[PDB]
């Protein structure tokens, strides 16, 4: 449902499987992070379910020996000169030698400044060692993070659990229809995307000739040419769209390895999993209570957050003993109002909108003995809707491969442009998750001095205790990136900016920056950056040096008596949308071994009133409610029809009987040669 999810599914180390351990036998010892994992696995990124530590991911630089061991690169220092021979070590060799941390004071010549540095030893012990002793140094920090975790800016401030969750959910974000590049990121936003393979890459350098949405034809440097065909609105394995959009014109010269077209979540090559939204960190009227998130209606009006979920419905006409199935308009008795959508083939016309209860592919089933055909047309399931993207047909007359007895097969694609809806889940890159408690109108939201509504609000009572203040620094740097800054070199350069490289002393508004994982925008540099931000339009700096602005209550008008922490935070739409979650049942299919209701949204199904709930009901003393929750609602084969009849005709609800599943238990016990008898006398 991403390119990142596809990428991270590769490079995944699954400790469970055939010939390996299992969950039952997996104790706490095999799931921890053995200190030899440093560089050969992701200490942060693991699933939260019953797989914690059993399913990790390869580190960015990790390499695989032919024997199956996981090597890591290392730089060989030879008496205080950090050299450039990247030698790959295994776990055992790395334990043999002594390895220094990645970030150390190298004095521009390969020698160390501090007399003793943090260093790893054979069994993972961390100490200080004389500088001359050191013989190995890490290639670079972020060597001990997978692809997913390496994209979390300010990861050095997030407690490991929140970073774990954020790295997990970066694999869940749905691909939007804009996919703006993040305003704050790391160096991995590019390589990841290019490695994910979504973006078409120039096989060889050349000159563009023809650009079109369908395909791009490029003149190669020597006579020949190549055409890259683009996948437009192709279904993804989890129902998301897989659009590709070209980003070159007819006259451009393309170099070898250049990014030619965006993928589902890419933006000029970079990974664009979400949007930069203007966020405030105040508790607003309780609607953002206990992780809930408030949204501006602007995000709905402007279509900032919106995904195109494509579905796939298929039906096949088979040959039976009573006759041969054949799809056609000649359905059994039915009004003409419902054949409007169908074309001459009996399938729904491409582009025709469909809703719950509508017909997609008419189909009539040989009725035989008791019309020669009954009704079996593919009706779109309950709660679905959208436009019909495309119709694929396979016919026996076309000499196409089909399962035996299948005269025909039809696949119908229905795609819905699902908007953002309250109840849906949103989350940043720091595991600061939450549902959309309420989508306020644009007017009654806080706005800054010059009337810019905040596009999102987050509860303040989720930053401190979760120990993921990294997002706060993220939004601070995001505001600095959006407004643009200019360090004033009136007297040399400010001391806090001494370590800052050039090209960062100035930056235009909306200048995307990068803060790599474990070395990046220090606190002092961020403070100094915030101290001098160029005014947006007038001589007005909305955000003071503290990162907090003066927000005007859009609901009442008077300003909020104290400032508010406002900024630009990157958040993404997670694939937990309510329209796939909601479900009700009143009378649906029942199982056949036991007459209890089915279970699942794919069917109607109910909701399992398990054992703990029954204990709760017994505790309350509610006896009749429990009885009807276990007898007439689910099991009493005679009870269901009678109670439904009573409700519809309005009579009293009858007395529950004996659960059928109890009868089945009795019959099974009897069939076990245990004479289990009953009597009341």
């Amino acid at each position: 449902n991403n390119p990142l999810s596809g990428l991270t599914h590769k490079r995944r180390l699954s400790a469970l499987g055939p010939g390996g351990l299992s969950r039952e036998r997996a104790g706490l010892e095999v799931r921890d992070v053995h200190p030899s994992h440093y560089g050969r696995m992701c200490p942060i990124e693991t699933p939260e379910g019953p797989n914690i530590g059993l399913i990790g991911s390869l580190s960015v630089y990790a390499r695989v020996n032919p024997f199956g061991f996981i090597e890591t690169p290392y730089r060989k220092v030879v008496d205080g000169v950090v050299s450039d021979e990247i030698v790959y070590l295994t776990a055992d060799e790395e334990d043999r030698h002594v390895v220094a941390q990645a970030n150390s004071p190298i004095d521009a010549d390969g020698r160390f400044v501090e007399p003793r540095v943090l260093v790893r030893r054979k069994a993972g012990e961390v100490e200080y060692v004389p500088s001359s002793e050191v013989d190995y140094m890490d290639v670079s920090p972020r060597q001990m993070v997978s692809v997913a975790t390496a994209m979390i800016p300010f990861l050095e401030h997030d407690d490991a659990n929140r970073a774990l969750m954020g790295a997990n959910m970066q694999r869940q974000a749905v691909p939007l229809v804009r996919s703006e590049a993040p305003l704050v990121g790391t160096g991995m936003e590019l390589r990841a995307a290019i490695d994910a393979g979504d973006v078409v890459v120039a096989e060889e350098s050349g000159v563009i000739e023809e650009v079109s949405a369908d395909y791009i034809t490029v003149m190669h440097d020597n006579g020949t040419r190549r055409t890259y065909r683009m996948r437009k609105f192709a279904r993804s394995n989890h129902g998301t769209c897989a659009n590709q959009c070209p980003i070159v014109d007819a006259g451009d010269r393309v170099e070898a390895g250049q990014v030619i077209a965006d993928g589902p979540c890419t933006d000029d090559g970079e990974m664009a999993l979400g949007k930069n939204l203007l966020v405030a960190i105040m508790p607003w009227e309780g609607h953002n209570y206990e992780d809930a998130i408030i949204l501006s209606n602007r995000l709905v009006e402007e279509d900032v957050l919106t995904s195109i979920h494509i579905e796939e419905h298929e039906i096949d006409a088979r040959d039976t003993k009573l006759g041969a199935e054949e799809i056609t308009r000649d359905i059994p008795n039915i009004s003409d109002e419902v054949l409007a959508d169908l074309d001459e083939r009996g399938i729904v016309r491409i582009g025709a909108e469909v809703r719950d209860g509508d017909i997609l592919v008419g189909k009539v089933t040989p009725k035989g003995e008791t019309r020669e055909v009954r009704d079996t047309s593919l009706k779109v399931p309950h709660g679905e809707s959208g436009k019909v993207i495309g119709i694929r047909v396979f016919s026996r007359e076309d000499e196409d491969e089909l399962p035996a007895g299948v005269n025909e097969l039809v696949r119908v694609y229905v795609a819905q442009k699902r908007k953002i809806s309250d109840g849906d889940k949103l989350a940043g890159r720091h595991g600061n998750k939450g549902v959309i408690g309420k989508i306020l109108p644009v007017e009654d939201m806080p706005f800054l001095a010059d009337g810019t509504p905040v596009d999102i609000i987050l509860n303040t009572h989720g930053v401190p205790r979760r120990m993921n203040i990294g997002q706060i620094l993220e939004t601070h740097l995001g505001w600095c990136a959006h407004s643009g800054w200019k360090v004033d070199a009136a007297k040399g350069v400010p001391d806090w900016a001494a370590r800052l490289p050039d090209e960062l002393l100035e930056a235009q508004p909306n200048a995307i920056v990068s803060t790599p994982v474990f070395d990046g925008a220090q606190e002092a540099e961020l403070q100094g950056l915030l101290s001098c931000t160029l005014p947006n339009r007038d001589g007005d700096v909305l955000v003071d040096a503290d990162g907090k602005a003066m927000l005007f209550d859009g609901r009442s008008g008077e300003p909020f008596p104290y400032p508010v922490t406002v900024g630009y935070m990157y958040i993404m739409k997670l694939h937990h949308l309510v329209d796939d979650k909601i479900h009700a049942r009143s009378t649906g299919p029942y199982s056949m071994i036991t007459q209890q209701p089915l279970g699942g949204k794919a069917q109607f199904g109910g909701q399992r009133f398990g054992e703990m709930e029954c204990w709760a009901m017994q505790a309350y003393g509610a006896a009749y409610t429990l009885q009807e929750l276990l007898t007439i609602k689910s099991d009493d084969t005679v009870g269901r029809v009678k109670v439904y009849e009573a409700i519809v005709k309005g009579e009293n609800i009858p007395e529950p009987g004996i659960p059928e599943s109890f009868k089945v238990l009795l019959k099974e016990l009897q069939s076990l040669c245990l004479n289990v008898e009953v009597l009341s006398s």
Partner: peptide
Amino acid sequence: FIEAVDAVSFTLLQDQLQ
């Protein structure tokens, strides 16, 4: 995972004949 309008309906239709 292997699979009241008509039952209620049949009772009602017999009554409708009544």
